Ligand binder design. Structure first.
Ligand SMILES: *C(/C=C\C/C=C\C/C=C\CCCC(=O)O)=C\C(=O)CCCCC
Ligand SMILES: *C(/C=C\C/C=C\C/C=C\CCCC(=O)O)=C\C(=O)CCCCC
Ligand SMILES: COc1ccc2[nH]cc(CC(=O)O)c2c1
Lengths: 260, 274
């Protein structure tokens, strides 16, 4: 069976590499400084970042808000929607996932993408900032935290999580299995056939356990610690939805709003 | 097979179970015995409505399980004040249990308080599942049984307090853990280290790691054929967090809607800036 677990782990890694452009290994090389990314540390930096390197985001569109805080918040949305498709492609590569009731596949993705988005966003963050637009840029943590109204605190919670999550020192091969475990959560509301879902997650967990023991022999109970982080993830997610709610108190296209 | 390493983990498991039995008067084993209505000496009086409640005070005498307020003129309030007193008593039991966790009393005094402050309700909900089945919950140390529907029809504010507990319990109980398992799981909850405001996270994480090791072996030896029970159990910890958060919000509403109802100081201190 150990062979089958290593096969699964390898398969997930390969798929993870193909589905996600910017890996943690790549992101870390850039973050530690081991072509420097454009650093957005203030307002003028931003404006030059958009101009000197048209960030493939919302910035191009007219009739927006031309208000930095609002445009930054919306760029986060554009990228999130983009990430959702990468996550979806990856999910279909998970053994058994496609064979699940189609409604359940949609339910799992619906409730799983936010947890995965923040998990992976941690790979692109350090206590000082976050990598943006395929790593071409680095947006300062301080800059983000200096945004007015409720925008100054929308990213901070992700940073706090990232700092702690990153302490586990997971690599892409570990993350590939962890992400799949998140997707196959049988406790998502509205599921029609929980059994198959838990059966797959059980096999994924077994693979994750072996992966962490072979990959980090020195880290006692790393498996247990990683699973505990699920608590942190869901907290950051619900917390995110709440701010997202309060946002409907600022009033920050129709087809665009439909898309995002 | 057996080695000095796993031997130490088994000794710790035994210690924790022993201490658990000494700290908690109503174990899951006793709870299930009463619930499975097996015997004729352990039969609880069932409170499923007002009249039953009225007569319950007679049969399953409540040594003021509900704060001395005589006829508090309100079922919802009396029941509520009743669960408050029980919670305080449970906090006392858990506190006694915590001191038995190797290394716990050796940690910084402030962290000791922090760990109890954030771990207490999570443990209470975990153990409360031992006293529940899909139809109700044992009360007054097992002498009584209050139905889920009765509690569910209390009143706008209160009628919603227990449902989330029951929902959790039905799923958690599906794991079929026994007291020896829970003693370690509860110890793991207490020694988190990821609690807000901890001064020295390191020593705490070292203790928890050893407890997680103890829990892992325990589950595999006690539940041979229950694949990934360990991981499924740890995932339940997020369910507990949810319950607590939701319960806190309910309390805020009660605080404002019932300005004439006192809330226990101990509990108030625990929820403060939580
Ligand atoms: C926006 C919110 C989520 C990012 C979505 C997925 C995370 C994984 C990779 C993308 C990160 C790179 C990037 O941020 O573009 C978070 C923000 O930092 C807002 C900035 C707006 C994006 C340029
Ligand atoms: C209160 C309702 C629910 C119980 C609340 C908390 C559970 C705490 C401890 C359980 C023990 C678990 C263990 O140690 O195994 C119900 C009442 O008590 C009110 C009714 C009183 C009648 C007026
Ligand atoms: C229903 O009344 C209450 C009031 C305050 C409380 N604090 C802790 C609990 C335990 C639980 O949630 O069962 C509780 C119950």
């Amino acid at each position: 069976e150990s062979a089958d677990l290593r096969a699964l782990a390898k398969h997930l890694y390969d798929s993870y590499i193909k589905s996600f452009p910017l890996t943690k290994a790549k992101a870390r090389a850039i973050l530690t400084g081991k072509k420097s990314p454009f650093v957005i540390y203030d307002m003028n930096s931003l404006m030059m970042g958009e101009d000197k390197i048209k960030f493939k985001h919302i910035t191009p569109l007219q009739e927006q808000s031309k208000e930095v805080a609002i445009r930054i918040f919306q760029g986060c949305q554009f990228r999130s929607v983009e990430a959702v498709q990468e996550i979806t492609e990856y999910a279909k590569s998970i053994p058994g996932f496609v064979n699940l009731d189609l409604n359940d596949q949609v339910t799992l993705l619906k409730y799983g993408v936010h947890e995965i988005i923040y998990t992976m966003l941690a790979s692109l963050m350090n206590k000082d900032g976050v990598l943006i637009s395929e790593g071409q840029g680095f947006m300062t943590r301080e800059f983000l935290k200096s945004l007015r109204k409720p925008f100054g605190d929308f990213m901070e919670p992700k940073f706090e999580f990232a700092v702690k999550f990153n302490a586990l020192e997971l690599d892409d091969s570990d993350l590939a299995i962890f992400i799949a475990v998140i997707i196959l959560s049988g406790d998502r509301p509205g599921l029609l056939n929980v059994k198959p879902i838990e059966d797959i997650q059980d096999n994924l967990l077994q693979a994750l356990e072996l992966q962490l023991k072979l990959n980090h022999p020195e880290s006692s109970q790393l498996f247990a610690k990683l699973l505990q982080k699920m608590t942190d993830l869901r907290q950051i997610v619900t917390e995110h939805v709440q701010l997202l709610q309060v946002i409907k108190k600022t009033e920050t296209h129709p087809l665009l709003q439909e898309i995002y």
